Amino acid sequence: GSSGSSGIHHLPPVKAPLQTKKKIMKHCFLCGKKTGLATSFECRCGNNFCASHRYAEAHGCNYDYKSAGRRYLEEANPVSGPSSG
């Protein structure tokens, strides 16, 4: 003769879908129209503007771009300049 018994247990698995998302959201600095996603440009100053205000003048740019880049030109007075022979 004889006898005996016992017990058992269990436990469910643990896990979580760790997702992550992050995208840049740019937008004209003048008016404030979305540009990042699409229609984005850079100005001599750096500020990001829209295709409509992408040009410096468009937003009365401040950056001094006189040395490197110009539009209006004038003829200098008549000089002899002996430099040349």
Ligand SMILES: [Zn+2]
């Ligand atoms: Zn704009």
Ligand SMILES: [Zn+2]
């Ligand atoms: Zn500018």
